[PDB]
Amino acid sequence: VAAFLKNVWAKEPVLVASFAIAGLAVILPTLSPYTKYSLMINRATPYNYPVPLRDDGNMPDVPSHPQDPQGPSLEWLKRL
Amino acid sequence: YPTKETAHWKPPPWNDVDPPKSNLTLNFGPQGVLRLVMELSG
Amino acid sequence: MFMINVLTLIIPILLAVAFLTLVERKVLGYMQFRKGPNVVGPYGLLQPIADAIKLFIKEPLRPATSSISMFILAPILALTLALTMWIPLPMPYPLINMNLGVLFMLAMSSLAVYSILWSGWASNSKYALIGALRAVAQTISYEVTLAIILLSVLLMNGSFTLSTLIITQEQVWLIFPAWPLAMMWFISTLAETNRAPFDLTEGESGFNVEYAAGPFALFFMAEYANIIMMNIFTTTLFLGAFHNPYMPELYTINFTIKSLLLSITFLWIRASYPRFRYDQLMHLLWKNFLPLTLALCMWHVSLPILLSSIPPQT
Amino acid sequence: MSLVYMNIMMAFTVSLTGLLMYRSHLMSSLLCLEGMMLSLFILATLMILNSHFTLASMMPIILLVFAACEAALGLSLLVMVSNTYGTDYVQNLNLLQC
Amino acid sequence: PFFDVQKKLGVDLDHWMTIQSAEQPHRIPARCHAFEKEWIECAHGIGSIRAEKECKIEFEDFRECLLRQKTMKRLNAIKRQRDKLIKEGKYTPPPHHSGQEDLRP
Amino acid sequence: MMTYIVFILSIIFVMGFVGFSSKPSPIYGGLGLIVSGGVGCGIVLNFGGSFLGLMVFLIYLGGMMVVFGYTTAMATEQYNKVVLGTFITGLLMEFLMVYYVLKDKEVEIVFKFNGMGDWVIYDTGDSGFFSEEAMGIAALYSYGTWLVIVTGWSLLIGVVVIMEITRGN
Amino acid sequence: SRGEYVVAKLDDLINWARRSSLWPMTFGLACCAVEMMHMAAPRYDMDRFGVVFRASPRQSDVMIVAGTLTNKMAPALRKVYDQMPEPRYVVSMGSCANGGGYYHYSYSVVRGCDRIVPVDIYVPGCPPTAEALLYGILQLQKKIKREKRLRIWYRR
Amino acid sequence: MNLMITLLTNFTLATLLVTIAFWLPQLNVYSEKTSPDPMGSARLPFSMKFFLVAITFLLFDLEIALLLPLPWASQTTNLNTMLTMALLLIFLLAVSLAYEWTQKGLEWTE
Amino acid sequence: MWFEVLPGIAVMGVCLFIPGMATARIHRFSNGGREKRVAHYSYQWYLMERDRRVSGVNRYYVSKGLENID
Numbered sequence A: 001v002a003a004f005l006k007n008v009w010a011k012e013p014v015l016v017a018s019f020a021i022a023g024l025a026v027i028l029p030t031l032s033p034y035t036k037y038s039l040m041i042n043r044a045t046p047y048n049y050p051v052p053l054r055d056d057g058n059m060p061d062v063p064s065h066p067q068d069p070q071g072p073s074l075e076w077l078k079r080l
Numbered sequence B: 001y002p003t004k005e006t007a008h009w010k011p012p013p014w015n016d017v018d019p020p021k022s023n024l025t026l027n028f029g030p031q032g033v034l035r036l037v038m039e040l041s042g
Numbered sequence C: 001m002f003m004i005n006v007l008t009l010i011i012p013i014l015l016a017v018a019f020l021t022l023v024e025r026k027v028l029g030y031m032q033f034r035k036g037p038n039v040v041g042p043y044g045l046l047q048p049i050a051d052a053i054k055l056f057i058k059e060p061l062r063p064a065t066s067s068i069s070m071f072i073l074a075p076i077l078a079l080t081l082a083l084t085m086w087i088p089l090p091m092p093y094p095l096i097n098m099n100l101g102v103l104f105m106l107a108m109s110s111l112a113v114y115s116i117l118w119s120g121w122a123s124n125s126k127y128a129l130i131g132a133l134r135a136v137a138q139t140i141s142y143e144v145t146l147a148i149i150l151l152s153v154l155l156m157n158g159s160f161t162l163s164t165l166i167i168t169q170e171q172v173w174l175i176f177p178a179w180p181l182a183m184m185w186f187i188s189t190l191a192e193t194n195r196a197p198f199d200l201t202e203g204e205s206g207f208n209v210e211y212a213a214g215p216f217a218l219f220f221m222a223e224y225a226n227i228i229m230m231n232i233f234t235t236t237l238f239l240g241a242f243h244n245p246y247m248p249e250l251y252t253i254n255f256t257i258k259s260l261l262l263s264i265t266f267l268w269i270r271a272s273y274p275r276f277r278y279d280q281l282m283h284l285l286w287k288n289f290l291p292l293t294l295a296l297c298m299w300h301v302s303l304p305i306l307l308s309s310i311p312p313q314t
Numbered sequence D: 001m002s003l004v005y006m007n008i009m010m011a012f013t014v015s016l017t018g019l020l021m022y023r024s025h026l027m028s029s030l031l032c033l034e035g036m037m038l039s040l041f042i043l044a045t046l047m048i049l050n051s052h053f054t055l056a057s058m059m060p061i062i063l064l065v066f067a068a069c070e071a072a073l074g075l076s077l078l079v080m081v082s083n084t085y086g087t088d089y090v091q092n093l094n095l096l097q098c
Numbered sequence E: 001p002f003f004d005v006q007k008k009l010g011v012d013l014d015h016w017m018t019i020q021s022a023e024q025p026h027r028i029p030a031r032c033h034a035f036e037k038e039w040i041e042c043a044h045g046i047g048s049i050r051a052e053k054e055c056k057i058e059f060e061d062f063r064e065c066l067l068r069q070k071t072m073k074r075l076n077a078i079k080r081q082r083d084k085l086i087k088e089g090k091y092t093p094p095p096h097h098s099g100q101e102d103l104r105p
Numbered sequence F: 001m002m003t004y005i006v007f008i009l010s011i012i013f014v015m016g017f018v019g020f021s022s023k024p025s026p027i028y029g030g031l032g033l034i035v036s037g038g039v040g041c042g043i044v045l046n047f048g049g050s051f052l053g054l055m056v057f058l059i060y061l062g063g064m065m066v067v068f069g070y071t072t073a074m075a076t077e078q079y080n081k082v083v084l085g086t087f088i089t090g091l092l093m094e095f096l097m098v099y100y101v102l103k104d105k106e107v108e109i110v111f112k113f114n115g116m117g118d119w120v121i122y123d124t125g126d127s128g129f130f131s132e133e134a135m136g137i138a139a140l141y142s143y144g145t146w147l148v149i150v151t152g153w154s155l156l157i158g159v160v161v162i163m164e165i166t167r168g169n
Numbered sequence G: 001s002r003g004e005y006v007v008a009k010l011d012d013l014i015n016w017a018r019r020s021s022l023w024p025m026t027f028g029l030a031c032c033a034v035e036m037m038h039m040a041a042p043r044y045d046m047d048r049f050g051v052v053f054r055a056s057p058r059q060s061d062v063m064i065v066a067g068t069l070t071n072k073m074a075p076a077l078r079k080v081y082d083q084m085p086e087p088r089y090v091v092s093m094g095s096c097a098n099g100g101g102y103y104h105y106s107y108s109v110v111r112g113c114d115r116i117v118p119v120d121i122y123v124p125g126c127p128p129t130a131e132a133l134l135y136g137i138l139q140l141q142k143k144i145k146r147e148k149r150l151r152i153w154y155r156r
Numbered sequence H: 001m002n003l004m005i006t007l008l009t010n011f012t013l014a015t016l017l018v019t020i021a022f023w024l025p026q027l028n029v030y031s032e033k034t035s036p037d038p039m040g041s042a043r044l045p046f047s048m049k050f051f052l053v054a055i056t057f058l059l060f061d062l063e064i065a066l067l068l069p070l071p072w073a074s075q076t077t078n079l080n081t082m083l084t085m086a087l088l089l090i091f092l093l094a095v096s097l098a099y100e101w102t103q104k105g106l107e108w109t110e
Numbered sequence I: 001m002w003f004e005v006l007p008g009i010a011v012m013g014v015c016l017f018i019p020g021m022a023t024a025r026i027h028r029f030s031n032g033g034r035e036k037r038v039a040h041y042s043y044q045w046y047l048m049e050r051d052r053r054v055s056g057v058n059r060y061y062v063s064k065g066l067e068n069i070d
């Protein structure tokens, strides 16, 4: 195996470099712990209007004001 | 049922292969100096 | 008022390509132990004017063209796509601010080969037709590699807007995270404009040999405008400058200096290497450049995902 | 309906009548077929962008690519014809009458 | 034959693109979302014959939203009558239809 | 007369089709198709389809018609009444439709066509901070998994088929 | 008068433009071509005069016949001269192009290239030095400078 | 309107320059030339390699068109599916390139 | 010596500096002494049209401040 790898590194370095880059690109997202950060960065972008909900009488988790403590927070994106 | 129109129609070949029915030549002029006549194949 | 802007865009292009011919002759001459033109004007500053007046009063060839429509139309399309292609350039503010300026420039790059094709067809010599076919094949192959490299770099950028490239390069240049793409982009733009060591029609025929002195001059103007604009595009894409919204002249001077250095690098490359063969440059593209382009495209697709480095859409 | 719908449908109709009446060549008929595909592209994207059908905007690109792939196949067949009789005339493709 | 592989296997391959009132990126609505929604909730599960004979009103409304035949027909009638009365001299355009309105915002 | 701009462009579009429906020569037919493609790109540009118009310029004209003319240059060796006749005929019928629909504002051949401008059927709203057609195309990977799979398999099969059938052996 | 002055200045302008941008088409036949390339060398440097190196025959102004013109070669030279755009000039360099030189009495040598093409400047030598050929080119520039085409057109 | 004006200005400058270059020395008085290239009498032979690289360019251009909207598509919410489909598209492009490589497709125009 | 090529590069640099400076000065002159507004999406165009409709001059660059309210 090591003789073959040195042989192709001797004859065709371009293909070896291309295959190494492709393998890194295909195995690295599954190992880096920053993909979830990309996911919730793309989730937190407000493209649409956050249309309010009618207060039936029992919604303790939803806030009543934008500056209320309820709702999702964004301190992780502020720090990262 | 042959008619006048379909009188020259020949039967197809048994293997259904028909007879297949060149080398390019260039002349580089004297435009030291040399005249070359080249025969290519692509 | 806007036509004044259009004229101040398009007339300095012609002045710049005439003095680019002068600068090419001088810089090429000084690199091989001699001088360039310094007799016609003070340090040869009147050389392009004399060349233009000489070329515009020479007798036209009047070749026996099969078609006169394509013969007329090829310089028309060449000059039109040379001059139209300068308008979305953010220097630092573009003439026409468009959402998809990169795609616009790629579309005109793909469209520019019809001048070569019609020039090859209109000439009655079939050897010129063969040379035009080879030039067309080279141009479309390097069009493919240009498109893939541009796609990966813009995926780092995040949008097709050309003015956003100044914003995304405020901290550091894009030649630092994308230097293999930078090298391959530079070679691809070198081979796109039939520049040495990728020109073939000069070596053993040309497609535009049958044109008169005037139409040959117009083809020369189109090619040199393409060279200057391609260097400006490389400067904007990889070597962006510091932009101050209150003093745009800082950005103008900076990217002008950088694009001048890149054009001098083009002339420098012209006087250093022997000519490639046709099959050798096909081998360089299809067996060397393309696998690395696809690998780096996969890498630049996956890299912002795994690094939380996705750029904004706007 | 709108005026441009009439114009695009008329363009499709004249390209169809151009395809159905071969003159001498086969490349001309192939060009007529690609003109038909282009008119289909324009009609489809006009209808899609008029009604703000968001997802359907992915469609005409496919309508290009597949049909464009077909065009490549057609060109190859023409070349094979040009390898046999030396020309792309349609009056040489009559070996199967008998 | 129409082998419903998708409904048997529970997979989704092209149902997201079949209709216009489906789920869209960024919840972008089409111009005829309500009309097609009403037609679909009428004709669901009653068959094609009952669908084409029972809620022709909803289908006519959806087709009118889609192509706008009657709207531009009414516009043609209004513009033609306005041009005829302009030629006959019995009508003039108001200042707010001439370009001196100093509009709302 | 400015408000009919798309309609005006559409005239040139169908005019360009009579450029190659008459089939004068593959080079002139290709030129007519190039003009028609540019005009159609302008037409879809006036409707908001910028990416699709640049798809027309990048892939149809610069990608496929280049190969069509490139193969044309390997045939129809360089050196009629019918071409001019059908060109004149098609132009006459086309201007007949133009005159009739500009006269009575409502014609019919197969469908009922209206004589007003194209500007009437436009939308009065705003799309916000995104282009709807741009995200519709961008949903090719998020939503169109099956379409991507079948298109990629088709292109790979097409490559195999093309290099197989021209071997001749 | 006004018109005579105007055509004189226009003739001077076009004469300067034609004489300051000479594009030569050499004929690499014999020894004199090697001396021509020695004139194109960095020491003498024709290119600083606006005289480019190895221009195409389809766009060139002046033809430099440098070498021996044989009987087997002369129709090609005449074809090249006939396919050159006006205004055109011919410079004969070396004894072979002038009058045959060493091979004047040969059976297969054209005794002078003036029998085939009209020659403007005769450069003598065997080979004439690179300074001599540069001097001949400068003398051709002087000959172009004193042209009077527009004056003849206005006077006729 | 600005883009149309710029296009018309570039086009009219181009045809003015072409007309000037093609007609200004036509008014001069000169002498005409006879109606008469290495392959004047020989016909042009077909070469399969140029047509093959043309169709290869066309197919790679179509897959480039498919791969193009990735900058817009990277801002999605199904990031795993988008990454998988992008990698699959480029992998199929590389597979087509390698299959053309192995079957002597890139021969003598490599 | 090598610096005799510098007049040509200076002329080229002037000719390349001209279009950017001209475009910036034209944009500042034609838009009330400020940058030309970028309208890449429909929301920015809606804002620009609102300023044009609220200015009373039919010029979007005449920005009405806090003096225009009660």
Ligand code: SF4
Residues within 6 Å of the ligand: G030, G031, G032, G066, G067, G068, G093, G094, G095, G096, G097, G101, G102, G125, G126, G127, G128
């Ligand atoms: S003149 Fe003398 S140097 Fe010149 S080609 Fe003749 S023999 Fe050689």
